[PDB]
Amino acid sequence: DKATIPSESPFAAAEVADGAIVVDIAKMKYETPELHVKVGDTVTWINREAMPHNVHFVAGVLGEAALKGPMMKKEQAYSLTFTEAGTYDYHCTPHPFMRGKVVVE
Numbered sequence: 001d002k003a004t005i006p007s008e009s010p011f012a013a014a015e016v017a018d019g020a021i022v023v024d025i026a027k028m029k030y031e032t033p034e035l036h037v038k039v040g041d042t043v044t045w046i047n048r049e050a051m052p053h054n055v056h057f058v059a060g061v062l063g064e065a066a067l068k069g070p071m072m073k074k075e076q077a078y079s080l081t082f083t084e085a086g087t088y089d090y091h092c093t094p095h096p097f098m099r100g101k102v103v104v105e
């Protein structure tokens with residue numbers, strides 16, 4: 001796959017790793033909708049609002065299968081470690097008007 005998943009479960013915002021590249025989610029938006037990172041970086045989304053959100057990459061984007069991330073409650077977080085350069089678009093499953101991308105370069 002083009003990204004690995006350190007934790008299939010969401011985890012607490014306080015449990016975010018040093019060195020992770022954080023994208024906050026608030027006001028029904030990914031606060032960094034176009035994030036540029038390097039191969040090997042871990043991106044961590046942190047939900048800062050009451051409304052639950054996830055990240056969802058359709059099949060073929062991060063690998064053969066779709067990656068439908070777990071729903072994050074407020075102050076929960078979720079990581080992906082990107083292993084291959086490319087452009088990886090995602091959306092929020094319940095809120096598909098929320099769109100973002102990670103550009104690994």
Ligand SMILES: [Cu+2]
Pocket residue numbers: 052053054092093094095098
């Ligand atoms: Cu959402």
Ligand code: NA
Pocket residue numbers: 026027028049051
């Ligand atoms: Na909101």
